[PDB]
Design a protein around this ligand. Structure first.
Ligand code: MFN
Ligand code: MFN
Ligand code: MFN
Ligand code: K
Ligand code: K
Ligand code: K
Ligand code: K
Ligand code: K
Ligand code: K
Ligand code: K
Ligand code: K
Ligand code: K
Ligand code: K
Ligand code: K
Ligand code: K
Ligand code: K
Ligand code: K
Ligand code: K
Ligand code: K
Ligand code: K
Ligand code: K
Lengths: 296, 296, 296, 296
């Protein structure tokens, strides 16, 4: 199989069940919404050594579609453990969205995906020290928390789902610059797929990992040396000088599949791409297998 | 005292000793440098419920002044506890800079400020699983860690200092929009002060806090209700409808003082600003007191 | 009639027929597309003293919805004179898109709107000095022009329509900061409206004009003094200390009306707005009269 | 001569005398200054088919270094004809800066460079229709023009110099992605050089031209086929699959030389660059000849 002359390896991404929330942040403008967004979703590439996996879902929510009539952005926050996710919701919304100029936080978990709920707004409202007030806004139960700016509006409760984490594909390129141009094109495409996010910096992984380590016994993960171009005994095709990985989390398997589909399609339009692969664990770890040949 | 007709309150900011590191991130472009920067310094407004306090120091480092000849950006990461700071250095550089396309990480702690060092590069190099290599780059001891992209270059060791955390001033404004325009002008000014950063979203705090809670026994902090415009018994001057706080951390007291100085000066040039105040704890907590009247 | 407490004057915007083109710019990334876009649409606020009226229509076209599978952005270029429009298409695509890294230019004028044709890509093809080559791409007739980068891809011909120019509303606020916050929320809303653009800087006019001048016979336009808050005998409501205008052009009257509607609604959600008005010429001149009360 | 393994051709850039102005734009924030700047400097890559050659000089002027204590950005506008330059100053400031929210325009031409004066602010003052008012601001003679926002502040007069236009170098790389990564690093470097600007989109020319035409007697200029990688009979080194040009204008020859020097050095640190060249016209046309070997 080839897409625009680029080899698609007959392999699969191995992905996992993971708990996820989806939050709508609105603010006085898109600019201020993004300010809160970047802060709240930062230090959140991987649960290997980050507190969560977080990223932007929809970069632009029209003011006419938000509960308060203001510009919005949707983000997603995820973790393998639901209790840690609830902690991460409280911390990131309370430290990064409550503190952000003009930003409000509303639930954006689709009705069908909702399995559980965490009362993040209620838990945050105690910051008001007795002065907090419940109200209804556009049919939503919200807390109005007095802050020095005026008020912080946060929805009482946020829906939690079991989503899919670790959808992925590798871009194998003739050089680093060609690999990165291809990878950014992929991420631009993934931007448009609702319910999916790419937690790594710019959505791109420059340092893909393997489980554990061969030489050490204190490492949870180490470099995927099989795919390292400066490693003597690497398993890279000839003419492959750089590898990038795109890692995708989503509300469901279909959102991850779509993000993988449009990502690869976009990457294969860029020059100097040799082949597309995917990362898996030989079916021994995950709950999902997304086969590349099935997507096209 | 008035600056452009704006009242400067005769008070002080009460700030604290805190451990800090300063990192230079370079990348293929300013764009990719900033990608790594935003990820690495996110979820880091306040040690109240964030793992660290982090932010950009110098947004633009010319390529001719970096060890590798590439565009750079300097960031600062801080914490009240040195052991937690060392953990935060490993986590943020390893998860957010090592994974970021093209980015390298070099020490940027000034010689005079260096009190301690953490071998973050050495500790990260084990990710190479035996394939990592030490080298010298522009006089610096660096580790070349094989990654799927090619290599991750990180300096062996990073200097740690005892800096100053919690420098601050309040902008009291006739309205939220006037407060925010004044606050952003202040942050634009603080951008130019080397050795200082503002950890909050866009550098601005919309929800300033007080120690503990009046009504609850489980909260380490709650809203500063004295400065809340919607609270009935607030201590706000008449005509003050919004308050923002700017919180500043720095390598030393002088860097924080300068950031406070240029910030207030910039804020007072914007329309609708009623007065400037500062947050303190009546001298009972901090190691530093920066009096507003002393700055002008 | 009020929106969130903001008066909506029972008046109308008076708008005009204008010739318009619509161009899809694709590039290796959204970043490089925007680079071409900002260059090609700049120096194009008003035909009073700029060569054209130009701006971004759709900020994000997904890769899978473009002819070449690459990230896209749509722009619009307008002028009262069709011959001048054709010259502007040639100049802006030839000098600002052809020269921009990786950028291609395709027709994005809807079939139902097309009235005339301008063979821009045919005209630009001669730059190839004999080496240019016609081809077909996703059903479109394109020219592949050899350039030092590789090739410039440009559609043979672009459609021209009689659109609408000069749709508008005024935001009257309690202060400059309040007015600008409301105005940017409006522009955020207008972003989402396909086939409409706001040609002024950030979509906002800080210096609205009237036809001619009371004092100077060499001027085609001068300040709208009745709405200047510093002018002594102004016709501004008390409490209004700042006025902004949002000027909108579009493919048809419906796009203009829609941009006006969502822009006003978004503006009215922001604090410190007193009323909304609109600029007309007494209904004695324009082809279109858009009554504010008819929008809601 | 090699820089980082990259050949530096023993050739020269041939550049020309050109008339130039330099403008300081201040605004409520860096964001709004940038809004005005992009509008005012757009449609200004080349005087071949654009009305002027314009670009950002300094991206960040600190508030305390500006006449009004507000965030600033400096831009430059050039043209071979002084009368056309004066018209371009009037058109670009009057239509793109006067109209931009909160933006002011001050002279930023160093005294040592000043040759001529253009009373732009005086010429713009008539827009005030009698209500305009001269004042002094930070020792500068300015006009306060009443506008719907409040006031437009513009310096009475702007200095004009005979600068340098057409400084250049070519980046010859192994691929388009490699070329563009090198070219952007170059532009990042050129950003830091005061008194020099790169007028093309993102600073980069994707379609360098040659004088005249081989096939068409009616063309003044066409694609430099000698440097087109898709042209069969090109004069490109083997292994070169992409060429970019960086074009630089500046206040004097030293600024141009400096931008060339740091731009080349930055480019050469990026992977996949084969050689650096420069464009000239046989030493017959230009006033300046800038030899690449003389820079390092
Ligand atoms: N999907 C891609 C991906 C890759 C990554 C990257 O994750 C990792 C995983 C592991 C590391 C190495 C961490 N180093 C240490 O733990 C040893 C330090 C140890 N020092 C001693 O040397 C022990 C003797 C101490 O005690 O500090 C870096 C990054 C994330 O996501
Ligand atoms: N300098 C500015 C600043 C301000 C801030 C903001 O910090 C805070 C400080 C305090 C909060 C309140 C969140 N905590 C909860 O109320 C816990 C609820 C509790 N539920 C229970 O009611 C029973 C106990 C539970 O879930 O464990 C939010 C943000 C950061 O930096
Ligand atoms: O080196 C640095 N600088 C690079 C650089 C490159 C450029 C690019 O400039 C140009 C220069 C010339 C062109 C070609 C313009 N084509 C014509 O005019 C149409 C002819 C003809 N068409 C027929 O179809 C009508 C019969 C007609 O209408 O007469 C485009 C762009 C600028 O700066
Ligand atoms: K998405
Ligand atoms: K907030
Ligand atoms: K689900
Ligand atoms: K993230
Ligand atoms: K199939
Ligand atoms: K700083
Ligand atoms: K990296
Ligand atoms: K110190
Ligand atoms: K931060
Ligand atoms: K639009
Ligand atoms: K192009
Ligand atoms: K039409
Ligand atoms: K425009
Ligand atoms: K000047
Ligand atoms: K410069
Ligand atoms: K202005
Ligand atoms: K000169
Ligand atoms: K330009």
């Amino acid at each position: 199989m080839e897409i625009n002359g680029v080899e698609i390896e007959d392999t699969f991404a191995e992905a996992f069940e993971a708990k996820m929330a989806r939050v709508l942040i609105t603010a006085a403008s898109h600019k201020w919404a993004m300010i809160a967004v970047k802060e709240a979703t930062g230090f959140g590439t991987s649960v290997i050594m980050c507190p969560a996996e977080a990223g932007i879902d929809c970069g632009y929510v029209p003011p006419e579609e938000t509960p308060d009539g203001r510009p919005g952005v949707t983000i997603m926050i995820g973790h393998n453990d639901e209790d840690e996710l609830k902690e991460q919701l409280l911390d990131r919304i309370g430290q990064c969205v409550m503190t952000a100029p003009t930003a409000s936080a509303f639930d954006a978990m689709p009705e069908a995906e909702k399995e559980d709920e965490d009362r993040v707004g209620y838990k945050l409202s105690f910051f008001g020290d007795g002065y907090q007030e419940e109200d209804e806004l556009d049919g939503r139960k919200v807390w109005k928390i007095p802050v020095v700016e005026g008020e912080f509006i946060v929805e009482d409760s946020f829906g939690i789902t079991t989503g899919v984490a670790g959808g992925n594909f590798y871009i194998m390129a003739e050089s680093q610059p060609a690999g990165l141009q291809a990878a950014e094109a992929a991420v631009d495409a993934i931007k448009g797929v609702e319910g999916a996010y790419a937690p790594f910096p710019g959505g791109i992984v420059a340092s893909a990992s393997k489980v554990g380590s061969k030489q050490y016994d204190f490492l949870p993960a180490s470099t995927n040396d099989a795919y390292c171009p400066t490693v003597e005994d690497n398993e890279l095709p000839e003419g492959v000088k750089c590898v990038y990985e795109i890692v995708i989390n989503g509300l469901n398997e279909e959102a991850v599949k779509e993000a993988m589909r449009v990502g690869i399609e976009a990457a294969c339009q860029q020059p100097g791409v040799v082949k597309i692969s995917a990362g898996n664990f030989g079916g021994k770890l995950g709950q999902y297998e997304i086969h590349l040949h099935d997507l096209f």
